[model samples]
Target: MNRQQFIDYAQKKYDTKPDHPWEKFPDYAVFRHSDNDKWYALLMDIPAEKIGINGDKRVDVIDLKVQPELVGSLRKKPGIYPAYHMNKEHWITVLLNGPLGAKEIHSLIEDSFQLTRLEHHHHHH
Candidate 1:
């Protein structure tokens, strides 16, 4: 899918709800949550152009789960790190343009959205 298609998909998926946050760029549209719920930031002309950091390590809202291959390829990126703030074992940085297709991406988006919407239940008292 092209950039607009992706944007449109995101919009339709979220339906401009209060939870979705959309940001427009010259080339692509970035959709994030006010709560850092990373859906699709940009089309990413070069998915590895800039390396992002996953700081917290505590599985919160904005979870980026990418294709395993994308993670390996990202090692060569400018400043990518190992599963920013996420557990490398459970999370990955997937590339949309890679082997994955638009359908799969959308499915993953739904998964992420559902996971984030659920309230975390800390077992520790």
Candidate 2:
């Protein structure tokens, strides 16, 4: 999915909008959880080569938090890459350049949103 499509899908699914906090890179966006304001996804466009692709072409990518167990396997896929700026062990960058379908992308989004949620556990001690 492209940028706008992802934005719309996220809005519909999460009932929240992408936040554009960086004035320098107006296109960069962040999707955060409303209750805690913790970011679950970050969208940006950088040189394709940044993710091991050829050329100086820029491509859109969404970085989402993921289970560490799934990171290695997902990185082996065509459009998924090590997250551009986040912790590689727990985050991944999904290329929004057609190799991955919307369904697969959305599935990852859901997982990321849930994974980033603040866990609540009562301490008996």
Candidate 3:
């Protein structure tokens, strides 16, 4: 899905609005869990060259946390890149320009959300 579509879908599906955390870069939006305030996704317009693309132009991308085992496989696909400003082992960058549909992207978002959620254990004896 395109950037706007994904943003709209996320807002609707997750019932969470984008967060503008950076004052200097107001365009960058972060998606976090309301219950724990942990980040599930981040949207940013970054230099294409940052992702190994041979261009000076900026591209819209979303960063999501992934299972370490799946990171290598995902990166091999088109339009997916290593985490830009985050840990390469735990995070990944998905280009908003396409190569994957919104459904597929949302799967990743769900995974991230579940992964970052606070675990609660109850003792029943």
Candidate 4:
């Protein structure tokens, strides 16, 4: 899925919108929980080489928080990669235009959204 598609899908699924905070790169979109301000997914157009792909061309990728157990296996897929500019263990970068389709991407989004969901931290002496 492309940027807008992801944005629309996220809006429909999470009832939230992508936040573009970087004035330097307007296309970079961030999907986060408003309650906790924890980012679940980040969409960006980065150099393909940055994502371990060939060529200097820029590719649209989404970085999502995922369970550590699944991170290694997920990277074994064609489009998935160790997250760009993020923690590799708990996050992954997905090529939006790669082999996976919308449904799978939706699953990933849900995983991220849930993983980053707001939580209450209580203190117990």
Candidate 1 C-alpha RMSD relative to the actual structure: 10.1
Q: Whose TM-score is greatest here?
A: 2
CA deviation > 4 Å runs, candidate 2? 117-125
Model 3 accuracy (lDDT, Cα): 0.77
The lDDT per prediction is 0.46, 0.76, 0.77, 0.75
| After superposition, candidate 1 runs with Cα above 4 Å error | 16-25, 35-43, 47-91, 118-125
Question: In model 4, what are the clashing residue pairs, if there are any?
Answer: none
**Candidate 2 colliding pairs:** none
lDDT of 4 at 104: 85
- Lowest lDDT 10-residue stretch of candidate 2: 113-122
TM-score of each: 0.43, 0.83, 0.82, 0.82
Give the Å error, residue 45, model 4: 0.5
- 1-125 in candidate 3: lDDT tens per residue? 77778777877877678888778988888877766655557788888898888878888888877788877777777888888563786878888775787778777777666776654444777
lDDT, candidate 4, 16-105, per-residue tens: 776787788787777677687656567778888987888788888877777778776667778887865536877788888778888887
Write candidate 2's Cα lDDT for 16-120 as tens digits: 776887888777788787666555577888889998887688888877777788777677778787875647867777889848998888776766667655554
Q: For model 4, give the RMSD to the true fold.
A: 2.5
* Number of clashing residue pairs, candidate 1: 6
